[PDB]
């Protein structure tokens, strides 16, 4: 009876990652935007599976969306691909069907913030645990 899941996430297409946030507006929805050539990722892959089963149940829900392959999205998610950018891998929060807020955050002039990536730096930037309630049973 839903037993036994073990780092598993919901995956989103370029055209259903928007049907579905529009079914799902009321719930807060993560997607992280990764490339299948972010290096960098690999340090996360880790991390955020780890995170995702944490805040995995009712309520908070967790998604991935390779725009490394997807030029559709992020184009349309203003995610640049480049291997020089500092755009991957890159986070979002959706509430109520509204960018919340996304990190690393875009300057003025058009360049993404050197920001440190840790589940302590997003759970707090995040308030994940404020979020999805608190740990403690």
């Known amino acids: 009876g839903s037993s036994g899941s073990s780092g598993?996430?919901?995956?989103?297409?370029?055209?259903?990652?928007?049907?579905?946030?529009?079914r799902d507006k009321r719930v807060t929805w993560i997607?992280?935007?990764?490339?299948?050539?972010?290096?960098?990722?690999?340090s996360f892959a880790?991390?955020?599976?780890?995170?995702?089963?944490?805040?995995?149940?009712?309520g908070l829900n967790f998604g991935?969306?390779?725009?490394?392959?997807?030029?559709?999205?992020?184009?349309?998610?203003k995610v640049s691909t480049?291997?020089?950018?500092?755009?991957?891998p890159?986070?979002?929060l959706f509430q109520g069907g509204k960018e919340?807020?996304?990190?690393?955050?875009?300057?003025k002039k058009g360049r993404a913030v050197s920001w440190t990536f840790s589940e302590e730096n997003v759970i707090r930037e995040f308030n994940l645990n404020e979020l999805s309630g608190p740990s403690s049973g």
């Open 8 to 22: 598993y996430i919901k995956y989103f297409n370029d055209k259903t990652i928007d049907e579905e946030l529009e």
């Open 31 to 42: 997607v992280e935007f990764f490339a299948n050539w972010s290096n960098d990722c690999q």
């Open 46 to 58: 880790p991390i955020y599976a780890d995170l995702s089963l944490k805040y995995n149940c009712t």
């Open 64 to 77: 991935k969306v390779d725009v490394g392959r997807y030029t559709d999205v992020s184009t349309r998610y």
């Open 82 to 88: 480049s291997p020089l950018t500092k755009q991957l």
């Open 90 to 92: 890159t986070l979002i």
């Open 100 to 107: 919340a807020m996304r990190r690393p955050q875009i300057d």
